[PDB]
Design a protein around this ligand. Sequence first.
Ligand code: HEC
Ligand code: HEC
Ligand code: HEC
Ligand code: HEC
Ligand code: HEC
Ligand code: HEC
Ligand code: HEC
Ligand code: HEC
Ligand SMILES: [Cl-]
Ligand SMILES: [Cl-]
Ligand SMILES: [Cl-]
Ligand SMILES: [Cl-]
Ligand SMILES: [Cl-]
Ligand SMILES: [Cl-]
Ligand SMILES: [Cl-]
Ligand SMILES: [Cl-]
Ligand SMILES: [Cl-]
Ligand SMILES: [Cl-]
Ligand SMILES: [Cl-]
Lengths: 471, 469
Amino acid sequence: PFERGRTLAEQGDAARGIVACAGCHRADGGGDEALGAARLAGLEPAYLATQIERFRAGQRSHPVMSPWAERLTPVDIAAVSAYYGALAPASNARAPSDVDAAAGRALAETGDWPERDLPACVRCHGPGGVGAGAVFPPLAGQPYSYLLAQLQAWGTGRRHGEPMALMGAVAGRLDADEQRALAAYFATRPLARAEAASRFTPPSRDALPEGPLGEMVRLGARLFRHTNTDPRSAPHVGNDQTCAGCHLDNGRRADASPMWAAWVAYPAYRGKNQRVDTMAERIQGCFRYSMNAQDSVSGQVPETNGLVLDALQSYIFWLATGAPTGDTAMSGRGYPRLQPPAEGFDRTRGAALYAEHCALCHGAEGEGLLVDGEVVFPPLWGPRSYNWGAGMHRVDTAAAFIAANMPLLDTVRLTPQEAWDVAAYINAHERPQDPRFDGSVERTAARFHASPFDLYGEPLGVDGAVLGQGV
Amino acid sequence: PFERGRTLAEQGDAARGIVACAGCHRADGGGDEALGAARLAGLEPAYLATQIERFRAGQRSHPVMSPWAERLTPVDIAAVSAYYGALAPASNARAPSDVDAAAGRALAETGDWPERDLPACVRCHGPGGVGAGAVFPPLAGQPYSYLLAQLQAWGTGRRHGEPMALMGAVAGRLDADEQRALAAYFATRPLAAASRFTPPSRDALPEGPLGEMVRLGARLFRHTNTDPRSAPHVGNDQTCAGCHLDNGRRADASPMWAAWVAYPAYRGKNQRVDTMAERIQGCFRYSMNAQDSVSGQVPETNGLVLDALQSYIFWLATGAPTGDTAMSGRGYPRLQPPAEGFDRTRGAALYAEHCALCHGAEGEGLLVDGEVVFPPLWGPRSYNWGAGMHRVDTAAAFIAANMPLLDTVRLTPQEAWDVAAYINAHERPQDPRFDGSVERTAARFHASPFDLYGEPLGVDGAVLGQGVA
Ligand code: HEC
Ligand code: HEC
Ligand code: HEC
Ligand code: HEC
Ligand code: HEC
Ligand code: HEC
Ligand code: HEC
Ligand code: HEC
Ligand SMILES: [Cl-]
Ligand SMILES: [Cl-]
Ligand SMILES: [Cl-]
Ligand SMILES: [Cl-]
Ligand SMILES: [Cl-]
Ligand SMILES: [Cl-]
Ligand SMILES: [Cl-]
Ligand SMILES: [Cl-]
Ligand SMILES: [Cl-]
Ligand SMILES: [Cl-]
Ligand SMILES: [Cl-]
């Protein structure tokens, strides 16, 4: 299959009237700026084949490429897909000198949640745009002309068919200048409104504090976003999660437990441990439960006067600039609470919904996706998810998160009841044991999980075994 | 001695024309409400004698008592003072039923700094008004009639002569209703503004368990050295409230509300970003000298003491905007450095004039039943050599704005510089950063023009920074 692919890429098949693919995509698979021919080298074979079939189906049209896509046989398609997927990545990109690639960095890496509900390109396209599996292709090293053409296509409807209409929604929220900057930005990578709602605005990401405090704010922002991979916090993280995955826009997003609403609210009484909690104590709670620190290398939450807690507290403090001390009800805090359903919650409808609207990113078995060790799509159950003591294991809490925040891009927004059903499906799977586990599921259940929205201990596992055994 | 005093108290002296003192002050020395006769039992003999001489001088006048004071000889005065000071405390006080003693609790125990720059009565008269040495007499158990007459006398000029005219300034700031309430309050105790942030009133505590923590932090702040929870981490005779006046509420006396919103922060003193908890542990390390405490350690950072103090500081800061590092009132007002330097000899004069009355001739301060009334300013029970207050600029900024306690006197900046240099040119507990050499420790941690550690400005010009061993 690599042999048919090679001969089609390098020489074509004169008999069948098929030109060499390298005539336009070049010998290294690196693309061509002048023709707007894509990079093919190293792309996921399933993606290449899907794109050839998109051309054939009319979801994509290009006067140059569509005819070569129609002349392929199915066996030819699979061969060239495997050939280009086996190549070493390569790029023959060259961005224009008249376009400021730095102007795209903001959207590429942090998006625009506040004005456009728009995630960063890298939130789906992987770190630095190297791709995130077969669904989500790389942008890094694709020629400028090719990237800009696709964005122009989706923004006008001359390209469609992708899952959940995701790129139509993205392209629809960009202006022409941003399209050029984003294309130049990703073409030059290496291959390896609150006022009108009366809501708080955190400081711009350019406005860091001066001097050493600013360096710590930056570190706290990176520990928040890369909790599981940074050498300082990783030894205290026992799963494949980051703070940013449940606190969207790196802690800035109203209705996704923004950190600015939390800073001014602690110290506070918390019924979960029957105790008043500082911000540090709270952050250590998150390491204990959402980051599963017991299964970390260190086995422990981070030291309370160490650099990790100091940076995280500095970052959170900074996001809260201007907010009124002691306001425990800032608009945007936490997740919007839902009315509990009169008629319960149905994990079977939930599994249908999850397959429809979530599995694309989070996986058919909740396994999530990691790229070069970074969390792209968090695992939602199993041994690399949050553990049974984490707040997100509750049905009401996760339902409120989901209804307001998932799917990531708001082409779809679930009803409360749909959110309740999907939340009950997700949180009825095993995940790491409660750190408060006593040895007995019933006992641990009666002391720490005695709520109608907590399925720990209920007989909903495999062949009706009780939930709450771990992995 | 005590024997002449007794027979003067119990029988008088027929010959010299002296009636028995117990006829009005009673046998137990507890006073008498009907006569307005004072409690004498347990008062400091120096105070009793000073008062008798006040009558003789005309600084005090009362037609009932003045004649018995003029009939005493110097030997007699010393004798009766000795007898009444050796007696067990006692009181025959009985306050009116038509006067609400709780209306005095506020002024008695927390003052009115914000509107009248007026300290609590116990700030000078000791815990629960039981007295603070010879200068400061007890109010507890004094008859209502007696206390109110004295407060009325000072308010009209029928009593004077007390040091720095302190009680004339105090009584001048009370209305008649408050005078009755305070007298009722102390007779019934046992014998053992605009453009600036406003913290919450002391009645407006939070609901539930946070409120109990805020309460606790307020008392650790006020009683740091005696409370069982914080005392094991305090190695000197200090409290937070002593340098952070009005228990952390007073603008220009490093209020806590301006600090809550300023941390985390880079601090040049340790080259690092410090949380509020880390900042507070530093205060234990230096201002409270935790090294010479029982535990030898500062309080644990997620322990009860730190949690309570941070809850209290948080509460005081209600409403303040996060991240405002320049709230008006923060810290102490910075002084322009003197082109004339600072003169410890000038300073020692001023200290004897305006400070020793309370802080002691030798800076020793005063304690009553373990509570800090007047902090030691040097010696083994003061802040140590790493504490901010040991710096001349910092202490001068505190003094110029806040001492003497009551604003009948306010030093000029140059005076504040001079007194600060005198105070901070005395020995005190060693820097916790001491590395074995005074010269090295001075070069690494005290190389500033406003720091005298290491310089030869001590007793007979000895190098400062040797500690108290
Ligand atoms: C942030 C503004 C961006 C930019 C500049 C791009 N994307 Fe996406 N993208 C997504 C999916 C599912 C696809 C595959 C579509 C299909 O199957 O046909 C894409 C593809 C692209 C391309 C085309 C790449 C190619 O090889 O042709 C380009 C140029 C592109 N994207 C730019 C999904 C998402 C998201 C999921 C919610 C988010 C966010 C983005 N993309 C963000 C961006
Ligand atoms: C020039 C005449 C070309 C020849 C010969 C081939 N391709 Fe091509 N291809 C070309 C252009 C100009 C483009 C961009 C089209 C657009 O919509 O802008 C393409 C695109 C592809 C893609 C999609 C890439 C992606 O990132 O999604 C694939 C998978 C692709 N081409 C495969 C391909 C194969 C297998 C060829 C030989 C059979 C081939 N192309 C020839 C221009 C030209
Ligand atoms: C999902 C698995 C999460 C991950 C990973 C992290 N957090 Fe979290 N956090 C989460 C929820 C569902 C809630 C609210 C409900 C509850 O009772 O737990 C929180 C709350 C916080 C807070 C307090 C917010 C407030 O009171 O307004 C803080 C300060 C917080 N979380 C910090 C935090 C950090 C620093 C994380 C990475 C170490 C982190 N969280 C991960 C869900 C999840
Ligand atoms: C890709 C386009 C996604 C789809 C479709 C859905 N989710 Fe998602 N989710 C996605 C990302 C990138 C993240 C992390 C956010 C970040 O900034 O890094 C998430 C996060 C969650 C979480 C938080 C739990 C955790 O352990 O991190 C939950 C509970 C979650 N998502 C649920 C969820 C459901 C139920 C969906 C279908 C309705 C769904 N997601 C769609 C990316 C995508
Ligand atoms: C009734 C005729 C009395 C006799 C006999 C003595 N004292 Fe007296 N004393 C009396 C009154 C009504 C007052 C209050 C005067 C005022 O200005 O309000 C006093 C006051 C004193 C004081 C001052 C106490 C203080 O707390 O400052 C002292 C020290 C005192 N009296 C001592 C004293 C002695 C030693 C006596 C025997 C020689 C004596 N008093 C007799 C009423 C009467
Ligand atoms: C320090 C600035 C003081 C504050 C604050 C208060 N008082 Fe005071 N008081 C002070 C001194 C130095 C003296 C001694 C007077 C003397 O002649 O030496 C006093 C005395 C009193 C007395 C007289 C007691 C007696 O036995 O005669 C009373 C009744 C008194 N003080 C009341 C009082 C009240 C109610 C205060 C709070 C409002 C208060 N004092 C504060 C110094 C200081
Ligand atoms: C004098 C001997 C002090 C004692 C006892 C305590 N503190 Fe202190 N503190 C003191 C000084 C001179 C300063 C610096 C002020 C300046 O203008 O330079 C401080 C500072 C603090 C701060 C930071 C305030 C801010 O940044 O605005 C806090 C939070 C603080 N101090 C708390 C504190 C506590 C809780 C104490 C009892 C445990 C305490 N201090 C004692 C002087 C003295
Ligand atoms: C009694 C009337 C006082 C006079 C006169 C002076 N001071 Fe004072 N001082 C007094 C009290 C009760 C306190 C503690 C306040 C509290 O609310 O508990 C203080 C505090 C100081 C401090 C803080 C230092 C510390 O180690 O705690 C300093 C540096 C200080 N005072 C200096 C000072 C000087 C220089 C004075 C003469 C100008 C002076 N004080 C007069 C009570 C009294
Ligand atoms: Cl994002
Ligand atoms: Cl990939
Ligand atoms: Cl058009
Ligand atoms: Cl569109
Ligand atoms: Cl940043
Ligand atoms: Cl695991
Ligand atoms: Cl485990
Ligand atoms: Cl009288
Ligand atoms: Cl006071
Ligand atoms: Cl209080
Ligand atoms: Cl108080």
